[PDB]
Amino acid sequence: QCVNLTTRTQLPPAYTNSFTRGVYYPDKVFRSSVLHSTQDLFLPF
Amino acid sequence: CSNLLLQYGSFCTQLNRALTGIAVEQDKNTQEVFAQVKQIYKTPPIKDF
Ligand SMILES: *[C@@H]1O[C@H](CO)[C@@H](O)[C@H](O)[C@H]1NC(C)=O
C-alpha cells in the first residue's frame, strides 16, 4: 500500500549552472588521439 | 542536410582555408604594392617646381 506524505515545506525551485557536464560516448569504437565531431542530443554547456 | 554534410566536414574546412588564404594574399598584395614606405610625406604648400 501507499501513504500520502504530509510534513512538507515548499520553497522556490532551486537552479544551478551546469557547465561542461552531460557528455557521453557516441558509439562503441576505440578511437584514440583523434578529435572527432558529432551531432546528437546533448546537454548544452 | 546539415547532419549529412557533417560527415564530410574536412572538405569545406579545406575550402574555407583556401579562401581565407586568398583573402590574406589580397591584403598582402595591396600592402606590398602601396606600403613601400612608412613615412607619410605630404606636399609643401608652395608648388614651386
Ligand atoms: C492520498 O491517497 C489516496 C489513496 O491512498 C489518493 O487517492 C490521493 O490522490 C492522495 N492525495 C494526495 C494529495 O496525495
What does this structure look like?
The first copy, chain A, is low in regular secondary structure and 45 residues long. Helices cover 0% and strands 0% of the residues of chain A. Chain A contains no helices and no strands. The radius of gyration of chain A is 20 Å and the shape is elongated. The N and C termini of chain A lie far apart (42 Å). The interface between A and B is small, with 3 and 4 residues. The site of 2-acetamido-2-deoxy-beta-D-glucopyranose has 2 residues of chain A, from loops.
Strand proportion of chain A: under 5%
Distance separating the two termini of chain A? 42 Å
Summarize the main sheet of chain A. Answer: none
Oligomer: part of a larger assembly
Alpha plus pi helix count of chain A: 0
Q: Helical content of chain A, roughly?
A: under 10%
Judging from the principal axes of the Cα atoms, what is the shape of chain A? elongated
The kinds of small molecule bound in this structure are: 2-acetamido-2-deoxy-beta-D-glucopyranose
Structural class of chain A: little secondary structure
Protein name (chain A): Spike protein S1
Organism (chain A): Severe acute respiratory syndrome coronavirus 2
